[PDB]
Amino acid sequence: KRKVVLAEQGSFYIGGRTVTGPGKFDPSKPVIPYSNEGATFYINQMYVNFQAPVRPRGLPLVFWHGGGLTGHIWESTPDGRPGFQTLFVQDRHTVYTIDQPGRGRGNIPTFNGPFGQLEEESIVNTVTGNSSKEGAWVRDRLGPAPGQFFENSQFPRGYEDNYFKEMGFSPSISSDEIVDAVVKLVTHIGPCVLVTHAASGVLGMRVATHAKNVRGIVAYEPATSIFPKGKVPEIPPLADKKSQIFPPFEIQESYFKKLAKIPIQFVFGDNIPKNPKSAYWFLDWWRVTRYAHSLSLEAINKLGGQASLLDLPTAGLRGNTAFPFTDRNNVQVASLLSDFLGKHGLDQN
């Protein structure tokens, strides 16, 4: 069912700062080709879209895309089925979707000169990085190697091109500045729930420690674990005995303690190996990253928290990739999110 009734919708920019070029601007001189002379540039701002149902119930949801993505992933699946934006407006929540600084409609800070460089100042690095189709295939656990699917896969097969086309690079904007933009959004919205994904997992945890308005977190397949400073537990290397997972983020315990004050759920899909898998780097990476997250959640619970790990196969959902909210069974994944919101009173006024 695709129909949606909106009391209002729209979009806006929030957050960011400015940087200035040298000299002054003279309106009599040729304006194009564009010059840094006399220039003010707005940088690192974030794009925000919202859709509000008639008579909303409970708190607004803020859907935060993973690494190299945009709010598209919450709008539609690669095969054109409704995304979580539609499903949760239908579930009577106001829905915010963002393009964080450096991605999509967010700002990419570059000027007149080599990419990212404002005269002698490097705002972001000129050298970029970006996953290939092959790297993303294994990262997202479509299968163990590019072009191969797990038998049980929930991926919308045949729509591979559409899926990979949604992904791209991110300039080297500091995570501090990304977190700052979302803190400002949360201040603007009021009490809300963060729904994060992969690279935005750790960022949403950070936002919650800075913003009391974050009343809950659901994180799909978070990519970086978080611990109190100096209390990082022993985490093994990968099965190749050379690689490590992403270095866990460390925060002062007084901020970490704030995570114990709200319900937090991490959600993982399928096909994460239980045992070392030296032949398949990313499968093994996910094994150890999921383990690190289990210890992070345990640390929150030892501070009086209510932090849980939901493995979708234990709820009867088999074959999900690292994007469960765009997989073929995404309605069932959404149902489990609604269950979490309902259990914690986040769907009541």
Ligand X SMILES: COC(=O)c1ccccc1S(=O)(=O)NC(=O)N(C)c1nc(C)nc(OC)n1
Q: Of these, 92, 121, 126, 345, which contacts its own copies (CB under 8 A)?
A: 126
Asked whether position 114 contacts ligand X by CB under 6 A, the answer is: no
The Cα–Cα gap between 303 and 301 comes to 5
Asked whether position 285 contacts its own copies by CB under 8 A, the answer is: yes
The Cα–Cα gap between 321 and 276 comes to 19
The Cα–Cα gap between 235 and 237 comes to 7
Asked whether position 92 contacts its own copies by CB under 8 A, the answer is: no
Q: Of these, 121, 187, 246, 348, which contacts ligand X (CB under 6 A)?
A: 246
Q: Name which of ligand X, its own copies, none residue 116 binds, using a CB cut-off of 5 to 8 Å depending on partner kind.
A: its own copies
Handedness of CA 282, 283, 284, 288 (dihedral sign): positive
- Report 74-113 residues binding ligand X (CB under 6 A): none
Asked whether position 68 contacts ligand X by CB under 6 A, the answer is: yes
State phi, psi for 206 to the nearest 5 degrees. -60, -45
State phi, psi for 250 to the nearest 5 degrees. -115, 130
Q: Of these, 21, 66, 101, 156, which contacts ligand X (CB under 6 A)?
A: 66
Judging by beta carbons within 10 Å of its beta carbon (0-12, 13-18, 19+), is residue 242 exposed, middle or buried?
exposed
Region binding its own copies by CB under 8 A among candidate stretches 131-139, 149-157, 302-310, 339-347: 131-139
The closest alpha carbon to 224, from 206, 208, 247, 240, belongs to 247
- Report 134-163 residues binding ligand X (CB under 6 A): 139
Minimum distance from residue 345 beta carbon to its own copies (Å): 28
Asked whether position 224 contacts ligand X by CB under 6 A, the answer is: yes
Q: Which residues bind ligand X (CB under 6 A)?
A: 32, 66-69, 129, 131, 139, 198-199, 223-224, 246
